[PDB]
């Protein structure tokens, strides 16, 4: 039903096809799933009328199940074939939309099979994808349901003396036992590391008194999770457990203002004035909060340039944050799905201030 | 110096300039390695004439130390900094190269920004790449000896009733373990599962009178190792036991065969001859060999259709193998740089039939 709907939006906004490389478009549209194709030509090519094929390597000929396919064998000329099956279907020319994560090398080749003029899926494809249906969202509960019980687990643990990489190391298999996998490589920011929101785990020590910020992600049955929590080891300096308390406050606050109806950006100015009333504005330096599905990040964006009106469906992050260089940040992150015109939180780990 | 060489090169072939993402091609030129960039425009614009700039995302400031670049901040248009950067590099038409791995809609936004002819970077970088220096070199002898210690290592487990999966597992962490990271995700592949080259390590427990293949590899600074083994747990099937002795002297006189001067196809020719007087010619269904250094595969290839003449600094895989279905399968590879105009073993792991 999506790749007709898919379809039937080409014609509608004009483009007369669309070519679609393996990831997560492609798996949202079939179902097909690849294991590592790399540089081996594999694109699922549709036309607006209606018609549409999928070229891959013979290697995958038992992974394509029945779909509408055509093989090329290794030695033949994955394009010149592209450019037969783009003939049949009718699509030799013209407006055509690609795959946004497509290799460049694969586009370029492509581009001279035809005249064209491309623009990303991604465009028109987001209008579908973000609208999660019923089996998405049970989909996404339950790897927020994981997210939650991977947050408890660690809790268990003992961190003092364990450095960042170690104990990313540790959630990211605690994260591949429990489901399908890690959404993405889980971040572990200790003292004053959590003050880059980008930080990447390291070899720094971590040890009693230091603020952490824990970011990680579950995938189930193709969906994402991402949960941040912030930790405290023993007494955490007096100027965070503060900063803390607001970030608490911020959240909480662009939670209670999710509405059907709502722009984004009135979700993040939410969170936003809250921050900024206590003063520390200039330390919250990202958007509030991102979609999520079978991407970590996907639309709609919720920042103060986020245009997008809430509808019932959407699923988005809200994670405001503080950091303050040479001392730590905090950050707490919930995944919400917009339900009955209201905001309902996926994930349910604890939110209080925690000190192991 | 390899900028330098890069940009020299560039306009003795033809070219005007280079946009060149993050990767191994980004880093191997400057040195610049950017932690999951994902959708944010990063960019490395170089023109014939000398003249070259980096576009990043600000979050990147620190991690980018003195390189000449421009940041970009979330809530910008990249694509307009790029036009100006190309304005004043001289590059806003013309042809130019593209990293092979970029995103294409990266690629499509470039397009709106002039007339452009493209062409993959790989194409002309491979030149250089192709030649590793000494030092290269020594990391790739440091990602092959910690390879060889992995593999004393697993000879020490308790391999009987380990699942294919939990076996790569294993192997995996002891990977991330000593080094920087996995070169690729570990194989192991038993008894009948031999018999697919391509086989993803499963649920299946290995038992005794069963043949292992076992491929991995590590990094080290960047630079990878693949090695593979093949082991028996008990007493293994004669014919079997006579198809690895087969693979033995085929990997031999392949590596044997290497020297300065000779073309690529000759040595892949050399270890499938002896294949083939053997009587198994239809079972060995892939190249001897590939190229590696800061990716996995790379120039150059060392099958039927390699046309490169072998020279000293190159480095790639001598890896024949024999897969007979509902039998099992045998592989011995081993890491060779073309050294003094010989080849020499990078990996020196025990190559004898192993039964444990």
Same mark, same amino acid.
């Given at each position: 039903?999506?790749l007709?709907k898919?379809?039937?939006?080409? +014609?509608?906004?004009?483009? %007369?096809?669309?070519?679609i490389?393996p +990831?997560?478009?492609?798996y949202?549209?079939?179902?097909?799933?690849?294991?590592?194709? +790399?540089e081996?030509?594999?694109?699922?090519?549709?036309?607006?009328?209606?018609? =549409?094929?999928?070229l891959?390597?013979?290697?995958?000929?038992?992974?394509?199940?029945?779909?509408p396919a055509?093989?090329?064998?290794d030695?033949?000329?994955?394009?010149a074939?592209?450019?037969?099956i783009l003939?049949?279907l009718?699509?030799?020319?013209?407006?055509?939309?690609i795959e946004?994560?497509?290799?460049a090398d694969?586009?370029?080749?492509?581009?001279k099979?035809?005249?064209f003029?491309?623009?990303?899926?991604?465009?028109? &494809?987001?209008?579908?994808?973000?609208?999660?249906?019923?089996?998405?969202?049970?989909?996404?509960?339950?790897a927020?349901? &994981?997210?939650?019980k991977?947050?408890?687990?660690?809790?268990?643990?003992?961190?003092?003396?364990?450095?960042?990489?170690e104990?990313?190391?540790?959630?990211?298999?605690?994260?591949?036992?429990?489901? %399908?996998?890690?959404?993405?490589?889980? &971040?572990?920011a200790?003292?004053?590391n959590?003050?880059?929101? !980008? !930080?990447?785990?390291?070899?720094?020590k &971590?040890?009693?008194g230091?603020?952490?910020?824990?970011?990680?992600g579950?995938?189930?049955?193709?969906y994402?999770?991402?949960?941040?929590?912030?930790?405290?080891?023993?007494?955490?300096?007096?100027?965070?457990?503060?900063?803390?308390?607001?970030v608490?406050?911020?959240?909480?606050?662009?939670?209670?203002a999710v509405?059907?109806?709502i722009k984004?950006?009135?979700?993040?100015?939410?969170?936003?004035?809250?921050?900024?009333?206590?003063?520390y504005?200039?330390?919250?330096?990202?958007?509030?909060? !991102?979609?999520?599905?079978? %991407?970590?990040?996907e639309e709609? =964006?919720?920042?103060?340039?986020?245009?997008?009106?809430?509808?019932?469906?959407?699923?988005?992050?809200?994670?405001?944050?503080?950091?303050?260089?040479?001392?730590?940040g905090?950050?707490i992150?919930?995944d919400?799905?917009?339900?009955?015109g209201?905001?309902?939180?996926?994930?349910?780990?604890?939110?209080e201030?925690?000190?192991?």
């Amino acid at each position: 039903m999506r790749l007709e709907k898919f379809i039937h939006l080409l +014609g509608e906004r004009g483009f %007369d096809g669309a070519l679609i490389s393996p +990831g997560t478009n492609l798996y949202y549209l079939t179902g097909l799933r690849l294991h590592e194709v +790399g540089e081996r030509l594999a694109i699922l090519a549709v036309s607006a009328e209606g018609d =549409y094929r999928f070229l891959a390597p013979s290697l995958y000929e038992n992974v394509v199940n029945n779909f509408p396919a055509t093989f090329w064998h290794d030695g033949e000329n994955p394009y010149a074939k592209l450019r037969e099956i783009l003939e049949e279907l009718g699509i030799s020319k013209g407006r055509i939309l690609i795959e946004d994560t497509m290799r460049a090398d694969w586009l370029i080749g492509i581009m001279k099979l035809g005249k064209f003029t491309f623009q990303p899926l991604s465009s028109l &494809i987001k209008e579908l994808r973000m609208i999660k249906d019923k089996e998405e969202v049970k989909m996404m509960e339950h790897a927020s349901r &994981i997210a939650d019980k991977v947050f408890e687990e660690i809790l268990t643990w003992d961190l003092i003396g364990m450095k960042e990489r170690e104990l990313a190391l540790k959630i990211e298999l605690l994260i591949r036992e429990l489901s %399908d996998g890690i959404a993405f490589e889980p &971040i572990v920011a200790s003292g004053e590391n959590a003050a880059n929101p !980008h !930080h990447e785990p390291g070899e720094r020590k &971590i040890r009693k008194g230091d603020i952490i910020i824990l970011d990680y992600g579950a995938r189930w049955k193709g969906y994402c999770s991402d949960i941040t929590r912030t930790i405290g080891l023993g007494e955490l300096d007096e100027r965070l457990v503060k900063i803390y308390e607001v970030v608490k406050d911020a959240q909480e606050s662009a939670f209670k203002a999710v509405r059907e109806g709502i722009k984004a950006k009135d979700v993040d100015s939410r969170a936003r004035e809250v921050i900024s009333k206590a003063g520390y504005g200039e330390y919250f330096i990202h958007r509030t909060g !991102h979609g999520l599905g079978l %991407d970590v990040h996907e639309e709609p =964006y919720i920042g103060p340039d986020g245009e997008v009106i809430l509808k019932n469906g959407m699923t988005f992050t809200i994670e405001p944050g503080i950091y303050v260089p040479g001392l730590g940040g905090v950050r707490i992150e919930d995944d919400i799905v917009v339900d009955e015109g209201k905001g309902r939180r996926l994930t349910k780990a604890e939110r209080e201030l925690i000190i192991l």
